[PDB]
Ligand binder design. Sequence first.
Ligand SMILES: *[C@@H]1O[C@H](CO)[C@@H](O[C@@H]2O[C@H](CO)[C@@H](O)[C@H](O)[C@H]2NC(C)=O)[C@H](O)[C@H]1NC(C)=O
Ligand code: MY6
Length: 246
Amino acid sequence: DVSFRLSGADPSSYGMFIKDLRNALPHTEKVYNIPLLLPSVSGAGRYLLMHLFNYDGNTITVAVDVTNVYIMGYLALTTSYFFNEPAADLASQYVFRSARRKITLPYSGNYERLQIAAGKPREKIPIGLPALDTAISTLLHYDSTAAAGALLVLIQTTAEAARFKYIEQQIQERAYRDEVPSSATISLENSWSGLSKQIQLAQGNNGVFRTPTVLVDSKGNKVQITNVTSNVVTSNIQLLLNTKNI
Ligand SMILES: *[C@@H]1O[C@H](CO)[C@@H](O[C@@H]2O[C@H](CO)[C@@H](O)[C@H](O)[C@H]2NC(C)=O)[C@H](O)[C@H]1NC(C)=O
Ligand SMILES: Cn1cnc2nc(N)[nH]c(=O)c21
């Protein structure tokens, strides 16, 4: 499974960790040169463990669902924390079993719930490697309100960067200074599903999207994506959510 140490980390090692993370996900085929994630997987094989070390060397192990890259829960010393949702509960049966105590967070793992519990929308939460180091720190010692904020940072600096090279770049720019995410970043995060389905719906349709995907851009200008010729498809998105899961 994969590892990343914030100590002595620079834009380069981060890039390498994200690359390892992408390669750690199984896929059988590619769609328009892109890894298509598996429809489903059975058993403990459905989960990837990320070992993260903050600057001082403390660690938390995070469980990721390899069919969609969703964070399911994590382990901190001897306590495991899982999201309050069906998938996370199913996941609790194959990972962190040697945990002495298991705690269910008072919310499911989607941005919407996480922003409510955290009291802030993610447009106002600064991300970057320094923020990741603090997120790790905040998760070592339970606090549901603080954990909500920490998880919004953790998802973005890992799962979202895995899915979009642009977001990986946004985090490399933020390796020594945190900064709230750009509008592009957030609409990208929100479109992973839509884009994933459309790219797949295009392979029997000459690469033309059945229905266009609207995104906010680098500057803040609304922009339509209608075919697989766009940058987003040619050199941004890196993983595709199988339509089976949409
Ligand atoms: C596919 O989508 C692209 C946009 O990514 C369309 O691009 C046309 O040409 C340039 C970009 O190459 C844009 O300035 C235009 O707005 C688009 N042309 C017009 C006249 O609107 C491209 O036409 C689309 N269609 C196909 C079959 O690729
Ligand atoms: C990014 N994202 C959106 N919904 C999500 N739900 C869970 N459980 N984990 C995630 O990382 C996630």
